[PDB]
Design a protein around this ligand. Structure first.
Ligand code: RKO
Lengths: 327, 248, 826
């Protein structure tokens, strides 16, 4: 049946090329020989025999078989290399995670700078991302690695979330000690810079706000290489962490340790005067220092900017064309 | 979409173990020992109850597709616990599971792990994942026992006695093939039903529908008493066969 | 890691801007011409221009303006680079010693902001109170010109109008006032604001908003006698000033877009206008004086003067002389006469300044068997289209072949003693239903001619409507003799067929040498073409014969001969064809992990594919199997403009952000993944847009020329006419020359006080990285021009390594010899 994963062989796919190097293995684009559908196969190697099957892959298999959403990537099946006949101990063949092939990734499109996002395009893009995030947050799952690279986008204009390698369940009643450093420094929330270790789903919200700003400026908002440097850049725009704006900032481990040069005032509205009013409010709330005062995914969907966006019109972005290639 | 992980009691006469000449009692005994090994190893390592149960469910499912004569149970058990730890985010290093497995097993029993215990286990991980069809998410009677108990209102002490007694029955059902016959939701109800009978409590009174004598129907739709009795009978059999008695 | 050396062989020639004023002395009339990264200072004479000084800057010159604040004797120069380096410069001369003073400097980049569509705009107040900068959408930046602002500190004023087209400071206002055209969903508008340095915000402007032409392009600030502003469009010119409104819409300007403006009479009576077809107009302000004593604007008139080169900048100098600064063609001095000549023209060319124009393609070929090698470049666009033959002999000798149509690709066919050149010319839909060419050009002046009669796409049934006046491109293959450079044959391709790729080669067991052209069917409706042809021609006995044609489902962007087979890139696919004994192409193998395969290069059985956005891919043909294998790809994302293979392990690429990178195979087979990863080991900003990489060197080789430490030779052509040379170094030589750069940068004084390390930093809108793996040859070569005290200061504590002597401190004379050898590579 369709549910018997792990047995079908990767012979059934004609590999086209390599689309990227992942965390547990490389990911190669391929075509299904029987249907013709394009898929992307993530390779999982247990030959290391250090700790066996990578937990990162285990998380992606466990969570994505539960999550059903237009804006969350689909793991179609799991296939294997031709296994050694009747000798599992000698067998070291790898396993593959088959996913749908999404034509482009946002980091790549922004890096070329070819794409030109309108307000309506962003509305459609942000609405899908937030709807996907809301579905996941409602199921009590945290992404913990929100990056431009992990946002896949078909030419059709549909968006899908992608790297659930660092995703884990969130318990509101029982605080659990987690991993301090999860999100990439450019999109990492301030609370985690100070090392909350017990973080809320609002960490993903902060990143998506950094993405929201990034779509408007065509540039990541906070680009730094060191955790303290990021706090300074964030502090210049969003204001310095202080007890009045973040009552519990004093409880965070590094609050005294990590300090901005000055107690900067919030300037977000000023530095983003060009952003439309409806969106600027969304940014101010999404980029709120205190995780408790930071907006939720549902609240972003019930905002003037996104509430009246109709998903029937996806607004396909201005994808680079042939004249775009011409100088 | 998703696989079927439940069988009929009559089907257990036809496991690979049965057809290779193992009699029903021995396979039953082999399951209890493997489950309890998983339970005991993980408890020594400090593992969450869900992690223990997940390994046990993998274990029970595994030997629906394989024979006990070709796959030593204790190696399998250790492998299930090893994987369960990664699935449920309570990870342990394989060497530590072996260390604990050696502490608890005698010399004959640990001979199953062969000359290289870690290797026999780490190698099995490949077969386990394919066998359980990469369906790693598992739900356990524990969460339903609590979700349903939270909706009972009445004597704090009578309900807590019901829960703990039922909780004990859940731990004991992990040694049986009930995990393979009935969804966890039914198990949670069955253990509430059993504890209610034993403590002479009438649970309907604690529900929002105190005149609904079939109190469980508001938690689990479409469950005949036939099923709850079959489960209770199977749970109490373990106590009668052993020397142990009902907790009360 | 990899080590390479890049040197400029020919400096940028295209004119990017030009201004006039009193910069060198309060007395002289100066012409400052800006070429990419280069500033040229001239003094205006009665015969022409006297050069006085040229400086380089570590940046692309974006804004160039002269102003004279109260208290200064002479004009000061403001320059802003494209990386947002701002400075104020002063000319100072001490007898024979000429130097440029950096009076104020700083970087005005904002942490957060959206770069505007119409680019950086810089303007200065008529009272020289402030510098206005339009860098980001929705923001206006003000640098106040106070004596104390030596760091050019500035503030932003929120601007409601997000999409601004153009802005100027106005003349004749009580306060500093800006007039600008902006675009919102309701069309384009003209609006005014006043700028308050005290309040640091805008106040209501002197006159109300007016709706203007949809394609309103330029804002002209009219001087005090009239005041107000003029707005230039595609069809109309309008004058605005409070209650006064004029509009002239002469049919002559509708024909060609007007791109540049300059003022002839300081009082604003006469302005000069130029258009993309090279026409030069005079805009006249007809005055009417009232009995009140006031002077008003009565009417506007437009008069056609003649033809100039298509000009990026116009500047009137004096008398009848105008300097025409051209980016697409040669720049000029022309004289405007009061009387027309017998052809009706008032414009007569005086001097012609060579501009290599856009170098779309080029090939290096030894025409005279000299062994020196000559470089033939496809240069210019439209009327300025030309072939330029360049040889070394100390200056470069350049010959120009006028084409009067756009050249696209060039390839040399020795067997036929001629070149094949792809070209396109502009025709316009005319009343016949066909099209008419604006001027004769190479493809129409060929000795013999032919037109494809291919029936491949003739089934059509796809409608493409035509409106009178619309432009179309007509693409042709030109056969041009290598000695006379006379057009021997022109083949006109199908209607709406664009020629993209061209090779000359033998295939298979076929002894004939062919011209092969890759084309694409281009229809305005399609974002990407879905049809194309690969055409095999033979040039024989003065005629071009169609030998074979292959239909492809896309655009044939690039082709290259591959060991007797034809390697062609069709859209996302890279395909290898075999040439059968029946003289027809046969598909052998395909590759499809490409978004858009724009560039192809081959060495042995290895292939390099340049994608629009996926950087470079190293492919290999596996003859035992008859297919392709992906060897290694550069996962870092870059937009590609041109690529080249340096050696079997190093690969060179050009980014559309004017940046250059070099990737290498990781050569460590530990994991298969490491090999399949190309690591970018070289990063260099360069500052120019590379279109064509070409192996070869122009230096004369007698086989006895001392072999330089640099190994290999790749020439590259750019959009601004700059030609450079890339070559490799040994680790020892790189470390030495790199250590020397750091010493030279501390010694050499930069114009604008721009750090050299910042200038060469790999820079995209999103990223900035320090350069790596590249030696700025121009910085190394400047060692020979710095004074002796500075030379000895540089060599202090500079020791040798990994040589015959492991530690050997060099002297100023040792390094002079080393650099002098490095100057002999070009
Ligand atoms: O990454 C993509 C296509 S975009 C791309 N193709 C490349 C080819 C080479 C290099 C970079 C590329 N980037 N699809 C995708 C992503 C995640 C999942 Cl799970 C499935 N499919």
């Amino acid at each position: 049946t369709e549910s018997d994963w792990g047995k079908r062989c990767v012979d059934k796919f004609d590999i086209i090329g390599i689309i990227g190097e992942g965390t547990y293995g490389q990911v190669y684009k391929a075509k299904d020989k029987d249907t013709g559908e394009l898929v992307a196969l993530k390779k999982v190697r247990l030959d290391n025999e250090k700790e066996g099957f990578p937990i990162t892959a285990i998380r992606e298999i466990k969570i994505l078989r539960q999550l059903i959403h237009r804006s969350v990537v689909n793991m179609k099946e799991i296939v294997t290399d031709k296994q050694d006949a009747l000798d599992f101990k000698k067998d070291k063949g790898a396993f593959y995670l088959v996913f749908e092939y999404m034509d482009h990734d946002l980091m790549g499109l922004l890096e070329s700078g070819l794409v030109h996002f309108s307000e309506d395009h962003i509305k459609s893009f942000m609405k899908q991302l937030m709807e996907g995030l809301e579905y996941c947050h409602k199921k009590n799952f945290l992404h913990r690695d929100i990056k431009c690279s992990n946002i896949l986008l078909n030419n059709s204009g549909q968006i899908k979330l992608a790297d659930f390698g660092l995703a884990r369940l969130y318990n509101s009643e029982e605080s659990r000690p987690y991993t301090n450093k999860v999100i990439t420094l450019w999109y990492r929330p301030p609370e985690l810079l100070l090392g909350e270790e017990r973080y809320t789903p609002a960490i993903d919200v902060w990143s998506c706000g950094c993405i929201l700003g990034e779509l408007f400026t065509k540039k990541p908002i906070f680009q730094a290489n060191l955790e303290l440097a990021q706090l300074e850049l964030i502090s210049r725009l969003c204001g310095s962490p202080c007890p009045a704006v973040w009552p519990d900032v004093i409880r965070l481990p590094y609050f005294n340790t990590m300090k901005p040069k000055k107690q900067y005032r919030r300037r977000l509205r000023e530095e983003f005067s060009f952003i439309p009013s409806a969106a600027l409010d969304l940014l101010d709330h999404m980029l709120t220092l205190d995780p408790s005062k930071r907006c939720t995914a549902e609240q972003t969907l019930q905002s003037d900017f996104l509430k009246d966006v109709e998903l029937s019109k996806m607004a396909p972005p201005d994808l680079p064309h042939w004249q775009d290639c011409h100088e | 979409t998703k696989p079927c992980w439940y069988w009929d009691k009559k089907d257990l006469a036809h496991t690979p173990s049965q057809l290779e000449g193992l009699d029903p009692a021995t396979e039953a005994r082999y399951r209890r020992e493997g489950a309890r090994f998983i339970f005991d190893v993980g408890t020594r390592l400090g593992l969450h109850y869900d992690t223990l149960a997940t390994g046990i469910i993998y274990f029970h499912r595994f030997y629906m597709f394989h024979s006990f004569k070709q796959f030593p149970r204790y190696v399998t058990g250790a492998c299930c616990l090893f994987l369960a730890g990664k699935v449920e985010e309570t990870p342990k290093k394989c060497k530590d599971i072996i260390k604990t497995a050696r502490s608890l097993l005698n010399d004959v029993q640990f001979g199953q792990f062969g000359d290289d215990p870690k290797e026999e286990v780490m190698v099995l991980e490949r077969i386990l994942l394919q066998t359980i069809k990469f369906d790693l998410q598992v739900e356990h009677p524990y969460q339903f026992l609590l979700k349903y108990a939270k909706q009972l209102k009445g004597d704090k002490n009578k309900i807590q006695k019901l829960v703990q007694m039922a909780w004990t029955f859940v731990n004991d059902s992990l040694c049986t093939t009930l995990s393979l016959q009935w969804e966890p939701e039914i198990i949670a109800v069955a253990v509430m039903y059993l504890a209610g009978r034993l403590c002479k409590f009438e649970i309907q009174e604690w529900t929002s529908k105190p005149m609904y004598r079939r109190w469980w129907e508001q938690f689990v739709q479409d469950v005949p008493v036939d099923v709850l009795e079959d489960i209770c009978h199977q749970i109490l059999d373990l106590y009668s066969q052993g020397k142990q008695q009902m907790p009360h | 890691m990899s080590y390479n050396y890049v040197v400029t062989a020919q400096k940028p020639t295209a004119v990017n801007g030009c201004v006039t004023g009193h910069f060198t002395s309060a007395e002289d009339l100066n012409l400052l011409i800006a070429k990419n990264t280069r500033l040229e200072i001239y003094v205006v004479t009665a015969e022409g221009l006297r050069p006085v000084k040229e400086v380089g800057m570590y940046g692309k010159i974006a804004v160039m303006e002269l102003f004279r604040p109260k208290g200064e004797s002479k004009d000061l120069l403001f320059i802003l680079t494209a990386k947002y380096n701002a400075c104020i410069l002063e000319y100072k001369q001490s007898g024979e010693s000429i130097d440029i003073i950096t009076r104020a400097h700083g970087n005005v980049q904002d942490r957060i902001g959206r770069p505007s569509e119409t680019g950086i705009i810089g303007i200065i107040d008529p009272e020289c109170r402030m510098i206005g900068l339009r860098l980001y959408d929705g923001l206006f930046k003000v640098i106040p010109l106070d004596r104390d602002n030596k760091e050019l500190k500035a503030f932003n004023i929120r601007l409601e109008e997000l999409h601004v087209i153009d802005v100027k400071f106005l003349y004749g206002c009580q306060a500093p006032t800006i007039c600008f055209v902006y675009q919102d969903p309701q069309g384009r508008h003209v609006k005014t604001y006043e700028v308050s340095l005290r309040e640091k915000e805008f106040n209501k402007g002197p006159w109300k908003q007016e709706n203007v032409e949809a394609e309103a392009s330029m804002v002209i600030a009219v001087p005090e006698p009239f005041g107000g502003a003029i707005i230039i469009g595609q069809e109309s010119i309008t004058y605005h000033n409070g209650d006064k409104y004029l509009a002239i819409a002469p049919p002559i300007i509708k024909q060609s877009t007007i791109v540049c403006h300059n003022r002839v009479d300081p009082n604003g009576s006469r302005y000069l206008l130029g258009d993309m077809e090279g026409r030069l107009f005079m805009l006249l302000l007809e005055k009417e004086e009232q009995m009140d004593g006031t002077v008003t604007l009565k009417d506007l008139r437009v008069e056609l003067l003649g033809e100039t080169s298509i000009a990026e900048c116009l500047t009137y100098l004096d008398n009848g002389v105008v300097f025409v600064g051209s980016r697409l063609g040669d720049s000029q001095l022309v004289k405007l006469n009061v009387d027309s000549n017998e052809q009706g023209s008032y414009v007569v060319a005086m001097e012609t300044f060579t501009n290599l124009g856009p170098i779309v393609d080029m090939c290096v070929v030894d025409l005279e068997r000299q062994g020196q090698g000559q470089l033939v470049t496809c240069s210019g666009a439209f009327k300025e289209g030309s072939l330029r033959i360049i040889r070394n002999g100390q200056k470069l000798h350049i010959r120009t072949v006028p084409l009067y149509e756009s050249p696209r690709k060039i390839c040399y066919q020795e067997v036929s003693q001629c070149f094949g050149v792809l070209s396109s010319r502009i025709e316009v839909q005319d009343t016949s239903g066909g099209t008419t060419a604006l001027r004769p050009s190479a493809s129409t002046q060929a000795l013999s001619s032919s037109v494809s009669s291919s029936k491949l796409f003739s089934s059509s049934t796809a409608p493409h409507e035509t409106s009178f006046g619309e432009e179309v491109e007509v693409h042709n293959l030109l056969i041009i003799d290598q000695h006379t450079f006379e057009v021997l044959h022109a083949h006109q391709f199908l209607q709406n067929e664009y020629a993209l790729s061209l090779v000359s080669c033998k295939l298979g067991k076929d002894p004939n040498t062919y011209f092969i052209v890759g084309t694409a069917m281009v229809y305005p409706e399609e974002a990407e073409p879905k049809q194309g042809r690969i055409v095999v021609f033979q040039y024989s006995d003065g005629k071009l014969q169609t030998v074979a044609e292959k239909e492809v489902k896309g655009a044939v962007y690039s082709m290259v001969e591959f060991n007797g087979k034809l390697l062609a890139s069709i859209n996302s696919t890279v395909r290898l064809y075999e040439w059968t004994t029946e003289k027809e192409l046969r598909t052998e193998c395909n590759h499809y992990n490409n978004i858009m395969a724009l560039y192809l290069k081959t060495k042995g059985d290895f292939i390099l594919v340049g994608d629009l956005m996926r950087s470079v891919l190293l492919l290999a043909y596996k003859p035992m199997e008859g297919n392709f294998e992906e060897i290694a790809r550069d996962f870092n994302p870059n937009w590609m403009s041109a690529v080249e293979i340096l050696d079997d392990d190093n690969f060179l690429g050009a980014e559309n952000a004017f940046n250059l990178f070099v990737c290498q195979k990781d050569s460590a087979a530990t994991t298969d993944e490491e090999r399949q990863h190309l690591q970018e080991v070289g990063l260099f900003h360069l500052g120019e847009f590379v279109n064509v990489f070409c192996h070869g060197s122009l230096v004369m080789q007698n086989l006895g020329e001392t072999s330089t430490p640099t190994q290999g030779s790749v020439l590259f052509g750019t959009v601004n006419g700059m030609i450079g040379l890339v070559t490799s170094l040994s680790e020892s030589w790189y470390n030495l020359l790199l250590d020397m750069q750091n010493r030279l940068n501390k010694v050499i004084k930069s114009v604008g006080k721009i750090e050299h390390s910042f200038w060469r930093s790999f820079h995209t809108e999103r990223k900035t990285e320090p350069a790596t793996g590249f030696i700025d040859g121009d910085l190394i070569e400047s060692f020979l021009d710095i004074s002796r005290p500075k030379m000895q200061e540089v060599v202090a504590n500079l020791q040798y390594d990994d040589g015959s002597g492991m530690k050997r401190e060099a002297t100023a004379d040792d390094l002079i010899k080393v650099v002098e050898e490095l100057t002999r590579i070009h």
